[PDB]
Write an enzyme that holds these catalytic residues in place. Structure first.
Site, PDB file in Angstrom:
ATOM      1  N   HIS A   4      -3.675  -1.380  -6.318  1.00 48.24           N
ATOM      2  CA  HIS A   4      -4.216  -2.396  -5.480  1.00 48.24           C
ATOM      3  C   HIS A   4      -5.354  -2.173  -4.420  1.00 48.24           C
ATOM      4  CE1 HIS A   4      -1.335  -1.306  -2.392  1.00 48.24           C
ATOM      5  NE2 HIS A   4      -2.371  -1.192  -1.449  1.00 48.24           N
ATOM      6  N   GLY A  24      -3.975   1.141   5.905  1.00 53.46           N
ATOM      7  CA  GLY A  24      -4.606   2.307   5.280  1.00 53.46           C
ATOM      8  C   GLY A  24      -3.869   3.400   5.062  1.00 53.46           C
ATOM      9  N   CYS A  31      -1.533   3.440   2.355  1.00 54.25           N
ATOM     10  CA  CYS A  31      -1.300   3.142   1.154  1.00 54.25           C
ATOM     11  C   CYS A  31      -1.818   4.188   0.362  1.00 54.25           C
ATOM     12  CB  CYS A  31      -1.484   2.139   0.573  1.00 54.25           C
ATOM     13  SG  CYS A  31      -0.785   0.506   1.007  1.00 54.25           S
TER      14      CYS A  31
END
Ligand SMILES: [Zn+2]
Ligand SMILES: [Zn+2]
Lengths: 306, 306
Positions: free
Chosen positions: B41, B143, B145
């Site tokens: 993503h 942030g 991820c």
């Protein structure tokens, strides 16, 4: 979201850990530039620790008696000296992994990360706090002496703790990197009782703010209090007296959440007088006091480190 | 003595963290040999996450659209591919700090360390567990991820988790390093409720053994039980059913302490039925289930890592 007891990334400190052996005793040392720092009781036998005269014991040691190993590499010792309760072993090679660093003597109530080490090898990292009675509640087995505690600001490691002793009650005592013990403790296997383990009020309040920010809000109430009124309750429950300096330090968290410091104190007052009625806050069933206000702001905003 | 929630030393993983940017989205990647692993993503806008068709979104991306920065250095991307829910960015330089490593898909109830990272920079390290409902209870802000979870055996890092998602209930979901989500979760901003958060019985028992080893013994009683009898209580309290496999795994801790597994189960039974009556075990006021039996043996013996 979520709030965890979080240690600093330990890589910068891992690169500084060495094994130090003197005679039959092996513990950990900290290698920064061309100096290795370790507890002076590396020169003691188990028998010596009942009543050691360190200056007399050190007279029988030469540079070549201090065996220093960084992983597989042997370091050459070219000088040694005692500063308070630490030894400084001068070596002929600067540690190429030396981070930007400072030595800091922390205040009770401040938190730091510990890199538990054995035989110079890192085992784990965890967070803890200097208790008001100048002990820490750590995880240290035999061989862990010389493990260090530290904080990291961007790229600079502030070393604040070296481990030396386990009290008979199972709590831990140690020094700053200048070798001065925190609190009244001494590097002697003797009777050393710890004082009252008082709760760090300002840290509990910071943690309550962290709870609200993360959605744990059941403990907010309709009440307020005053500093003097709250402190009557703090005294009864062996909490540190809250000062205006503490109130000021909580200002950013008050501003962010819109909950006045004294209103949060009234929430804490009710939790102390009534308990938590079988509920939890941030996964804890007791009031947590080893997050500082700076810890809370850091973890709730996401500050990193080079 | 002392027992702490302890993460693995994080230095080996710190050396693998990079920043990955695609379009307007920045998260973390893991650089091992000449491949960077990150959540797919990264190619989504905030709008895309409501219903993304990742294969169609990826057709609009070329190698030069994936900006990869290791600290100050830019990495050159020479290939990209999607494997389940992760992207593999092939770069032209092997990470010189690549540790010995494996990819492992862990089982519910197993624990691991998380290196929380933002913009490719490590922020903190903490321990957690794969819950029986395949979520984790972490500390992740926007942030984070691409932050990873891992275990270390001596010199080998076993990567087991990559962070992808926060559920609306504030718990966390992610993948193994092959890109397969733990549990039923998907990388879509949709309704995803977590199942029952069941307590990891074998870990609670391991932690009770840790308590006894460290002197917290008030909860030992004069009783025993059977597996089937204990499990009637486990069911009532939303604990995992205890199996003979669990009993066998606790064998070393039973042998060390001399307390039979089923006697410890009877202690746990009484703690579940009666509570802790305002007392604590290892500094906790609730039963802790994020230490595995292997975690307990490790910390009580002092195993290290190269
Ligand atoms: Zn020692
Ligand atoms: Zn994300």
């Amino acid at each position: 979201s979520g709030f965890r007891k979080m240690a600093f990334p330990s890589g910068k400190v891992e690169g500084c850990m060495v094994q130090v052996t003197c005679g039959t005793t092996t513990l950990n040392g900290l290698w920064l530039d061309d100096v290795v720092y370790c507890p002076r009781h590396v020169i003691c036998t188990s028998e010596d620790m009942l009543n050691p005269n360190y200056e007399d014991l050190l007279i029988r040691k030469s540079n070549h008696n201090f065996l220093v190993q960084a992983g597989n590499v042997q370091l050459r010792v070219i000088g040694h000296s005692m500063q308070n309760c630490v030894l400084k072993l001068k070596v002929d090679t600067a540690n190429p992994k030396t981070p930007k660093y400072k030595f800091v003597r922390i205040q009770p109530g401040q938190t730091f990360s510990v890199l538990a080490c054995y035989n110079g090898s890192p085992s784990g990292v965890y967070q803890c706090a200097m208790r008001p009675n100048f002990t820490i509640k750590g995880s240290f087995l035999n061989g862990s002496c010389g493990s260090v505690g530290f904080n990291i600001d961007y790229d600079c490691v502030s070393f604040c703790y070296m481990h030396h002793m386990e009290l008979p009650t199972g709590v831990h005592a140690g020094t700053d990197l200048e070798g001065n013990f925190y609190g009244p403790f001494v590097d002697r296997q003797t009777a050393q009782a710890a004082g009252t383990d008082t709760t760090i009020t300002v840290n509990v309040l910071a943690w309550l703010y962290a709870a609200v920010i993360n959605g744990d809000r059941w403990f907010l109430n309709r009440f307020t209090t005053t500093l003097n009124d709250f402190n009557l309750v703090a005294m009864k429950y062996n909490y540190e007296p809250l000062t205006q300096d503490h109130v000021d330090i909580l200002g950013p968290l008050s501003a962010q959440t819109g909950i006045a410091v004294l209103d949060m104190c009234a929430s804490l007052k009710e939790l102390l007088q009534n308990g938590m009625n079988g509920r939890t806050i941030l996964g804890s069933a007791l009031l947590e006091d080893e997050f500082t206000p700076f810890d809370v702001v850091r973890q709730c905003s996401g500050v990193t480190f080079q």
